[PDB]
């Protein structure tokens, strides 16, 4: 059991140690400030930002990264490790191969109708299901990208305390967004989670923080075929502020970690909205604030309504508090359901483990509406 921190983090070392270890990396990425923004909201849940210096072709600018957690250090490390993950993802010509030795079938990535299928830039990865090297498009690895094959996105990027930690996290994120994609397609999301039987004290603390703030939380089960918990936490503010209709989605082998991640992400979504620094937050502030509250509740009906309730005790728990064993389990479940490749690319750039994970055939529709496979509809039918 290499997972030493089980209660909130599911990591090999403490957040305090992570923060100590990444100090050099944080200067290398040109960090300008790291701040807590809890005060913007009424829920008293830790949310951090990190701002870093960026040059977008000509002008100097700022990139922002948000962090979430049950306590202060977790939220701060979350922001820092997102910033490092995202910095590590930028295009690196030293990794580019022009002639692919063993190219993936690019169709399996689920391509938009406008995809330029003439890939000129390839990157080598390791398929850890089949234990072989494989070449994947650069557009599927780096961020940002030229956007030739598809629009660049951050799905399956992760940093961590070691290689396996980053791989596990990025894999869980792929699983998360695939499941979220299926939920977005589904006409109904029938199953509510009652968190009363949580063994983890931090779930109760978080739920109670929302109640006192007059924020109604509903938990929805999005768990897909793999029996890897995916949970949506949806906030409904008694203030009827349309901008406070927010979702957080958590994914983990342990259902209580998934719930913790969903609950803290809700606070993160709310706080980044209220911060209004990001382009999407600013635009949501401008346009969605004019959308009547009752229209939004009506549009997103399926998220709030429910046909049945389960307990956490009803949810699968295949966590073993050991990275290699957890990865083994996931590999088996992916293979079992025809997801026969689990590919990672090493993106370590500033002395911190960072990867891209690619699991061909996993859906990204929730991020990019232009990408949706024929097989998603049957999957939705089966689960929902």
């Amino acid at each position: 059991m290499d997972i030493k921190y089980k209660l909130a983090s599911y990591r090999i070392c403490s957040p305090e140690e992570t923060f100590e270890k990444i100090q050099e990396a944080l200067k290398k990425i040109e960090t300008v400030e790291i701040k807590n923004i809890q005060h913007l909201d009424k829920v008293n849940i830790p949310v951090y930002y990190l701002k870093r210096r960026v040059v977008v072709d000509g002008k100097e600018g700022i990139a922002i990264h948000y962090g979430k957690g049950a306590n202060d250090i977790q939220a701060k490390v979350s922001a820092c490790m997102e910033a490092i993950e995202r910095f590590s993802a930028s295009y690196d010509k030293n990794k580019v191969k022009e002639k692919p030795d063993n190219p993936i079938n690019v169709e399996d990535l689920i391509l938009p109708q406008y995809a330029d299928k003439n890939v000129k830039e390839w990157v080598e990865g390791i398929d850890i299901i089949n234990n072989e090297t494989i070449d994947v498009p650069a557009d599927a690895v780096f961020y940002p990208t030229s956007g030739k094959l598809f629009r660049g996105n951050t799905n399956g990027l992760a940093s961590g305390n070691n290689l396996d930690e980053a791989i596990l996290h990025a894999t869980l994120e792929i699983i998360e967004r695939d499941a979220w994609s299926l939920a977005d397609l589904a006409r109904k999301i029938p199953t509510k989670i009652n968190p009363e039987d949580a063994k983890n004290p931090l779930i109760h603390e978080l739920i109670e923080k929302y109640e006192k703030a007059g924020v109604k939380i509903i938990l929805k089960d999005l768990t897909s075929e793999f029996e890897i918990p995916v949970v949506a936490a949806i906030s409904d503010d008694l203030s009827k502020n349309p901008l406070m209709l927010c979702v957080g989605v958590g994914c983990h082998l342990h259902p209580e970690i998934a719930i913790l991640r969903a609950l803290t992400e809700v606070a993160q979504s709310r706080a980044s909205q209220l911060h209004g620094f990001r382009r999407d937050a600013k635009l949501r502030e401008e346009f969605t604030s004019k959308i009547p509250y009752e229209r939004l509740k009506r549009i997103h009906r399926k998220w709030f309504e429910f046909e049945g309730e389960i307990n956490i005790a009803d949810m699968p728990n295949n966590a073993r508090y050991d990275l290699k064993k957890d990865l083994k389990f996931i590999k088996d479940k992916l293979s079992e359901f025809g997801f026969d490749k689990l590919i990672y690319v090493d993106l370590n750039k500033v002395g911190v483990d960072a990867v891209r994970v690619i699991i061909p055939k996993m859906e990204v529709y929730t991020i990019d509406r232009d990408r949706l496979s024929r097989r998603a509809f049957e999957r939705v039918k089966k689960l929902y």
Binding site: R151, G152, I234, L243, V247, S269, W303, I367
Partner: peptide, 12 residues
Amino acid sequence: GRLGFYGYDLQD
């Protein structure tokens, strides 16, 4: 349009 969310960037 959408519910508020956080966790990814997508280029336009």
